[PDB]
Amino acid sequence: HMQGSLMLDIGGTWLTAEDRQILRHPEVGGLIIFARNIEHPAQVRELCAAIRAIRPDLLLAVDQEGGRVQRLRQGFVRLPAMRAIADNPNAEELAEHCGWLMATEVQAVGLDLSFAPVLDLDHQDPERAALLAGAFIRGMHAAGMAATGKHFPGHGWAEVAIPEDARSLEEIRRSDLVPFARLAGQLDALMPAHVIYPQVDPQPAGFSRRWLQEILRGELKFDGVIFSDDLSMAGAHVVGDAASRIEAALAAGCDMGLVCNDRASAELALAALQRLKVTPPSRLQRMRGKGYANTDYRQQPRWLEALSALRAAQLID
Ligand SMILES: [Zn+2]
């Protein structure tokens, strides 16, 4: 009866028979790719095509995670870092161009969305930081891509258990919350922090009805997609299982559970969704990219004009 979906990953650069089978379950709604799955844009495009032949409705995401190493031969477009963009007189335009460039290439290789490091708002003048991230978001949207931020509500220092942050809500409100409050009406999706704020709630933000429903949906009026944090944590030696955690995440109001780097865990989370007979959240297809896969994107005028602006500003070449 209830609503939810799973986002998972694969181990390699091409699909296994096991991947093909698990992709057919309708409770699987997403796939994310990482460096280990990427050889070059051409192989990424062909991989996305193979997945869409199984499931045209999958949301396909690439995690950029602060640069993916060595896209040297026919690689992905190299974009300036946001700190370099900020120190220009036309930083807002340049951030727009960067978001449009990244989103245009990502969808040209058949993906729906990118998890971009500039939209990690708590691991980055903060009002100017919000302004430049908003401009990056306009570029992404102009290319037809939905924009994901993290980590709500914010915690960018250190902790091997799960971090706890002892600040009041009014102290969080006047600090880490401010980027989110400002981009909430512009972001299409958010990922929560793997942090407990005991002054506010005893559960991590990603399993807290109070963080997700009362502060985020209520106070911040956010109506986009809530991704869970990583419900597998493969290698961290946690106890509990991806199956109990995805139940906990959907209970709190997550739309889609992420189970990365642990196929065993993804299968347990999937069995959990099957028993629930979940159907996809009505929100979910907001993340579908309006762009399309193609190979001529680098010869288009808007692409060459975006690069010319970056170059005039001294940022590339
Ligand atoms: Zn963060």
Q: Determine the distance separating the centroid of ligand 1 and the alpha carbon of 30, expressed in angstroms.
A: 21
* Burial tier of 305 (Cβ tally within 10 Å: 0-12, 13-18, 19+): exposed
3 state SS of 57: coil
State the DSSP H helix or E strand holding residue 267, giving kind and residue range, or none if neither. Answer: helix 263-276
Q: How far apart are CA 254 and CA 4, in angstroms?
A: 8
**And the tokens for 268?**
């347990």
Q: 């998890």: which residue's tokens?
A: 115
Tell me if 184 sits within 8 A of 222, measured CB to CB.
Answer: yes
Which of 48, 158, 70, 172 lies closest to 114 in space, CA to CA? 48
Bridge partners of 192, per DSSP, are 152
> Catalytic residue at 87?
no
Tell me if 62 sits within 8 A of 111, measured CB to CB.
Answer: yes
Q: Which residues contact 73 (CB under 8 A, 6 or more apart)?
A: 40
Sequence spans of domains, the chain? 1-317
Q: How far apart are CA 231 and CA 248, in angstroms?
A: 10
How many angstroms separate the most distant Cα atoms in the chain? 57
Q: Is the peptide bond before 163 cis (omega within 30 degrees of 0)?
A: no
E-assigned strands of the chain? 5-8, 28-33, 59-63, 113-115, 148-152, 189-192, 196-197, 201-204, 225-230, 256-258
| Fold classification of 1-317 (topology level) | TIM Barrel (3.20.20)
Q: How far apart are CA 187 and CA 152, in angstroms?
A: 12
Q: How far apart are CA 105 and CA 114, in angstroms?
A: 10
Q: Determine the distance separating the centroid of ligand 1 and the alpha carbon of 162, expressed in angstroms.
A: 15
Q: At what angle do helices 242-252 and 263-276 cross, to 10 degrees?
A: 50
Q: Determine the distance separating the centroid of ligand 1 and the alpha carbon of 124, expressed in angstroms.
A: 8
Q: Determine the distance separating the centroid of ligand 1 and the alpha carbon of 154, expressed in angstroms.
A: 6
Show binding-site residues for substrate. Answer: 63, 71, 150-151
Show binding-site residues. Answer: 63, 71, 150-151
Q: Determine the distance separating the centroid of ligand 1 and the alpha carbon of 156, expressed in angstroms.
A: 6
At what resolution in Å was this solved? 2.2
> What is the DSSP pairing of strand 225-230 with strand 256-258?
parallel
Catalytic residue, candidates 229, 230, 255, 262: 229
